[PDB]
Amino acid sequence: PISPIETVPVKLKPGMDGPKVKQWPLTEEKIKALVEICTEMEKEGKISKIGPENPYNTPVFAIKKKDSTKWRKLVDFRELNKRTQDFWEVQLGIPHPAGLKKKKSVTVLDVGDAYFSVPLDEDFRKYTAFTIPSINNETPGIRYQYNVLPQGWKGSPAIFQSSMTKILEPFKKQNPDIVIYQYMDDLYVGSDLEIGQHRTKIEELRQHLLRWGLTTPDKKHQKEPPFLWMGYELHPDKWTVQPIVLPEKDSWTVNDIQKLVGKLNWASQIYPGIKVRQLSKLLRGTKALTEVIPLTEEAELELAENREILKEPVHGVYYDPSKDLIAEIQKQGQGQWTYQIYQEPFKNLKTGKYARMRGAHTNDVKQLTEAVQKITTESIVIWGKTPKFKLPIQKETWETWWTEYWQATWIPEWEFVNTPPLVKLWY
Amino acid sequence: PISPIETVPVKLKPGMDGPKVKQWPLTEEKIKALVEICTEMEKEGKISKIGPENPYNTPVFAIKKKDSTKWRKLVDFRELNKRTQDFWEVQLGIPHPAGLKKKKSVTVLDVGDAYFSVPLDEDFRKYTAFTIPSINNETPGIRYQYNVLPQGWKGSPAIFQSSMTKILEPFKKQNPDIVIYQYMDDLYVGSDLEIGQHRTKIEELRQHLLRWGLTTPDKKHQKEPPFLWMGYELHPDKWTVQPIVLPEKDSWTVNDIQKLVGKLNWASQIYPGIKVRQLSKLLRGTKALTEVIPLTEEAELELAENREILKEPVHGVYYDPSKDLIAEIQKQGQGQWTYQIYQEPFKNLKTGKYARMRGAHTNDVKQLTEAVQKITTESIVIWGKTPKFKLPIQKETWETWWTEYWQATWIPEWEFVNTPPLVKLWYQLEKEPIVGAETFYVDGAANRETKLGKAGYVTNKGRQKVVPLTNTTNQKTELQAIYLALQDSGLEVNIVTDSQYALGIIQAQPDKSESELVNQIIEQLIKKEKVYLAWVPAHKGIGGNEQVDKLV
Numbered sequence: 010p011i012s013p014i015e016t017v018p019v020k021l022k023p024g025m026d027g028p029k030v031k032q033w034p035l036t037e038e039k040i041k042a043l044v045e046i047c048t049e050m051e052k053e054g055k056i057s058k059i060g061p062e063n064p065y066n067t068p069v070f071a072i073k074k075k076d077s078t079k080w081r082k083l084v085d086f087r088e089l090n091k092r093t094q095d096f097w098e099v100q101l102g103i104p105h106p107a108g109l110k111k112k113k114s115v116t117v118l119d120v121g122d123a124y125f126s127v128p129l130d131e132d133f134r135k136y137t138a139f140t141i142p143s144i145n146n147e148t149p150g151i152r153y154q155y156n157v158l159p160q161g162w163k164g165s166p167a168i169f170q171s172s173m174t175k176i177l178e179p180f181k182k183q184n185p186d187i188v189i190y191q192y193m194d195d196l197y198v199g200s201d202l203e204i205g206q207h208r209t210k211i212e213e214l215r216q217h218l219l220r221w222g223l224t225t226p227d228k229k230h231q232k233e234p235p236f237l238w239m240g241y242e243l244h245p246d247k248w249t250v251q252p253i254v255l256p257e258k259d260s261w262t263v264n265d266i267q268k269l270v271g272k273l274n275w276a277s278q279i280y281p282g283i284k285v286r287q288l289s290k291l292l293r294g295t296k297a298l299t300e301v302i303p304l305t306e307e308a309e310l311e312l313a314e315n316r317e318i319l320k321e322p323v324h325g326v327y328y329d330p331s332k333d334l335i336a337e338i339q340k341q342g343q344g345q346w347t348y349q350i351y352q353e354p355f356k357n358l359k360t361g362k363y364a365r366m367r368g369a370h371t372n373d374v375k376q377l378t379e380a381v382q383k384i385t386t387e388s389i390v391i392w393g394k395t396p397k398f399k400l401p402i403q404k405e406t407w408e409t410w411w412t413e414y415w416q417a418t419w420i421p422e423w424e425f426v427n428t429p430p431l432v433k434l435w436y
Numbered sequence: 437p438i439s440p441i442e443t444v445p446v447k448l449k450p451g452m453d454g455p456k457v458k459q460w461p462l463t464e465e466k467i468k469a470l471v472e473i474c475t476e477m478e479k480e481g482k483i484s485k486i487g488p489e490n491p492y493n494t495p496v497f498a499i500k501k502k503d504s505t506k507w508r509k510l511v512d513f514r515e516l517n518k519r520t521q522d523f524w525e526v527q528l529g530i531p532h533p534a535g536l537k538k539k540k541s542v543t544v545l546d547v548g549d550a551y552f553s554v555p556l557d558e559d560f561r562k563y564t565a566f567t568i569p570s571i572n573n574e575t576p577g578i579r580y581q582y583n584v585l586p587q588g589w590k591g592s593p594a595i596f597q598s599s600m601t602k603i604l605e606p607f608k609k610q611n612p613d614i615v616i617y618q619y620m621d622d623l624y625v626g627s628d629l630e631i632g633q634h635r636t637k638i639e640e641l642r643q644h645l646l647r648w649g650l651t652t653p654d655k656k657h658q659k660e661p662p663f664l665w666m667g668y669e670l671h672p673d674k675w676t677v678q679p680i681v682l683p684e685k686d687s688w689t690v691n692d693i694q695k696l697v698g699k700l701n702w703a704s705q706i707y708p709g710i711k712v713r714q715l716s717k718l719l720r721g722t723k724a725l726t727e728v729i730p731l732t733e734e735a736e737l738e739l740a741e742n743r744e745i746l747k748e749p750v751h752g753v754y755y756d757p758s759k760d761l762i763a764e765i766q767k768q769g770q771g772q773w774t775y776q777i778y779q780e781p782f783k784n785l786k787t788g789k790y791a792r793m794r795g796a797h798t799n800d801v802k803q804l805t806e807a808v809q810k811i812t813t814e815s816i817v818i819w820g821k822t823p824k825f826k827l828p829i830q831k832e833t834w835e836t837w838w839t840e841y842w843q844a845t846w847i848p849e850w851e852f853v854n855t856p857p858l859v860k861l862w863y864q865l866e867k868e869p870i871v872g873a874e875t876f877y878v879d880g881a882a883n884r885e886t887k888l889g890k891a892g893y894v895t896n897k898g899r900q901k902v903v904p905l906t907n908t909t910n911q912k913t914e915l916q917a918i919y920l921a922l923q924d925s926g927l928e929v930n931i932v933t934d935s936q937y938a939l940g941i942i943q944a945q946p947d948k949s950e951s952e953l954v955n956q957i958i959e960q961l962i963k964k965e966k967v968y969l970a971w972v973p974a975h976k977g978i979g980g981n982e983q984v985d986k987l988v
């Protein structure tokens with residue numbers, strides 16, 4: 010390659026030192042993968058081999074990108090990021106278009122290849138360093154560092170902007186209504202025209218890029234369709250609320266009215282305007298449980314009163330961009346999971362549900378992974394920033410497999426919560 | 437003695453500068469030894485006479501042995517290392533022999549001397565500066581500087597291990613068979629040639645190294661197989677632990693209890709069945725040291741069994757990547773679980789244990805999983821793949837649970853191994869109230885101050901009861917009220933509690949828990965036919981619970 014530029018100075022946040030994270034042990038296969046990948050990257054001249062004077066270290070993995078035959082290297086730049094791009098979401102912050110979510114449809118295309126040409130400020134390299142492990146740690150790990158904007162590191166995109174908005178402007182011109190948002194390694198393009206036209210404006214764009222150099226290694230399919238008619242296409246205007254409702258019943262038993270009084274009392278932490286007393290007072294007795302019972306004075310007035318305030322969104326809930334996003338996920342069972350993305354308890358910003366097909370082909374884990382990556386994107390598309398998941402899985406387990414079905418270019422922040430009782434029911 | 441090896445550039449932490457410590461005493465005889473040492477050192481180029489040009493000195497010294505015939509220079513760079521950059525660590529983790537591939541013959545070459553052969557970054561020599569006083573006082577003494585790698589510098593293990601690795605490279609390629617591994621001052625080589633040829637190659641290895649100023653011997657001091665390493669006993673075809681010693685004492689103190697438990701886990705990697713729950717249950721007191729502890733009954737019985745175990749020598753086999761990796765787990769009893777990993781039905785590859793220390797209320801099926809998981813993590817690190825499991829659980833069981841459980845899991849490949857004990861659910865609560873069954877309106881509060889309380893119930897059928905309790909907590913009564921209903925109820929019961937605590941515990945479906953309360957309860961649940969538990973908001977709500985708390 011030829012030196013297409015003159016680097017840009019990157020200085021960590023003051024009081025901050027580079028990253029020194031541990032490398033997770035890998036599968037024998039995954040190694041061979043990276044090992045191969047890295048040897049090419051090395052010839053190509055992207056990364057270089059380093060010495061003992063480089064103390065730093067950041068995690069790496071091997072994943073299957075869109076299921077193709079060959080492996081893709083996914084570096085876990087989550088720490089170098091906090092340490093850098095946080096102060097690069099400033100100096101070079103990339104602004105988030107508050108209307109991309111309203112568009113009729115959004116396609117996403119991997120532009121990560123772009124960066125592999127802009128040489129990285131030499132005094133910063135040391136920090137990107139990663140190490141490929143060896144089984145049973147018998148052989149000293151191989152060690153490399155980046156000589157170009159590595160993918161995954163949120164400063165790569167932030168430096169490319171200039172170079173990007175240039176490549177795009179003479180398309181954003183003759184297409185002033187589609188909005189293009191760039192989040193790291195992906196490009197979110199949104200339009201309001203029948204999918205047929207969209208899907209074209211896309212390939213229309215996909216090529217603009219390709220003719221101005223950027224390859225969009227996204228040759229998804231042709232016209233030989235084994236059921237895989239899939240292309241990343243989201244529909245944000247349909248991203249609507251799922252008001253969970255109370256059950257309507259002809260015959261109401263003691264037990265039944267019981268749970269109901271429960272869900273409601275738990276509900277009141279999100280909606281304080283809810284009351285039960287009159288319905289509950291229909292429980293004050295010590296009757297059997299299988300026994301059916303009658304309405305009361307305003308009991309029916311309450312099952313309907315609340316049923317209302319509970320079908321209207323709660324006020325006071327705004328998006329503080331000063332805070333982080335917290336997504337909680339609960340397993341509902343039978344391939345069905347629900348989730349809540351918020352910033353303060355009970356003041357939910359958005360809540361959906363996810364679900365995968367029937368048995369014989371999918372496990373929980375794969376699901377969670379999916380639900381996650383799904384939710385994440387939603388979030389990126391609506392707020393321009395990924396949340397932090399409170400995952401209902403055993404830590405270690407997650408750690409072992411999250412990569413097995415992980416198809417995304419980025420990695421969020423997560424942790425593990427052994428707890429949800431009523432929540433499962435309430436949602 | 438010194439090589440044409442390229443040097444690793446080093447540096448001193450950000451704002452810092454060279455060490456300016458001093459020390460100037462003078463044992464006339466020592467000063468001779470050091471000046472005797474220094475010469476043979478500068479003459480060999482490992483150091484060099486430097487003169488006032490801001491050198492930053494450091495402490496010099498001399499030491500001697502009993503089987504002595506010489507002396508030893510021992511500088512102290514403590515205040516130097518506290519100024520040098522950080523380097524790429526060397527021992528991320530130690531390789532485990534349970535995952536070492538078999539070999540014909542091995543060999544270790546002493547390479548300690550070596551680090552005085554590898555060059556120090558020119559620009560960083562000026563700091564290794566020390567000064568050895570002469571006799572009295574017209575000269576500060578004779579002044580030197582290091583040219584290779586100081587014996588105690590921070591970045592020396594590093595810069596060495598690196599340099600070595602680069603030098604081995606040609607050899608390592610021109611000989612993929614040969615496995616080379618360097619540890620501290622050792623350089624182990626292992627191949628498949630018959631001793632004769634092996635030593636041909638070895639000597640080549642040697643010659644190779646020699647061209648690079650790193651010398652070695654052919655008949656120095658120590659012994660060969662077995663190779664004592666990291667507390668391991670290594671043989672060209674098998675491997676085992678360091679012979680251990682279970683001390684016998686009249687009075688044991690924490691320190692000895694610890695050091696006793698420590699050795700036991702270490703013997704666990706290959707000795708089958710070693711228990712440890714009891715001996716540690718003791719150490720549960722965290723701050724004594726010379727505080728003697730009474731080895732209780734259990735601990736005692738336990739220790740012995742590990743003796744019966746240990747009395748017998750046990751060795752492990754190596755890993756053949758040509759075959760599968762099988763993993764079998766059996767429950768020992770009180771949260772104790774054991775396992776051995778093999779490819780071959782007789783001799784093992786490795787073994788271990790798993791006891792749910794965490795919390796105080798877990799199920800038998802959950803635990804089986806935490807285990808399967810503990811091992812999966814293990815194999816990945818050691819062999820790079822997941823084993824095939826053989827475990828005492830029947831699908832119906834398992835699948836039932838992962839379906840009922842609120843958390844997500846992922847049990848890989850697994851075959852059922854019918855052999856007692858057996859993991860299985862002893863009971864299941866009903867998902868729908870049982871029609872006909874009497875309905876118990878359970879409750880029970882306690883005085884946080886007086887530790888006095890009560891637990892009663894009031895049924896639909898008009899039946900009541902209130903039992904007084906002394907020395908308890910609300911959670912304790914909130915559990916005794918439920919155990920109460922159970923004792924007085926029939927074979928099919930409906931229970932209502934205003935306690936998410938008691939609720940969830942019971943719900944987890946605990947095989948056990950030593951909390952004798954929960955046990956009596958768990959056992960009642962087992963003796964029942966149909967049970968249905970029901971939660972309800974404590975205060976604002978029903979009148980049955982309150983009706984028992986006005987009582988309380």
Ligand SMILES: Cc1cc(C)c(Nc2ccnc(Nc3ccc(C#N)cc3)n2)c(C)c1
Nearest residue numbers: 531536537539542615617624626670671672
């Ligand atoms: C110390 C020691 C010596 C060597 C040569 C290795 N590396 C490897 C790499 C691949 N297979 C083996 N088998 C092996 C190692 C030592 C002995 C002995 N004695 C026998 C077999 N060792 C390690 C990890 C430790």
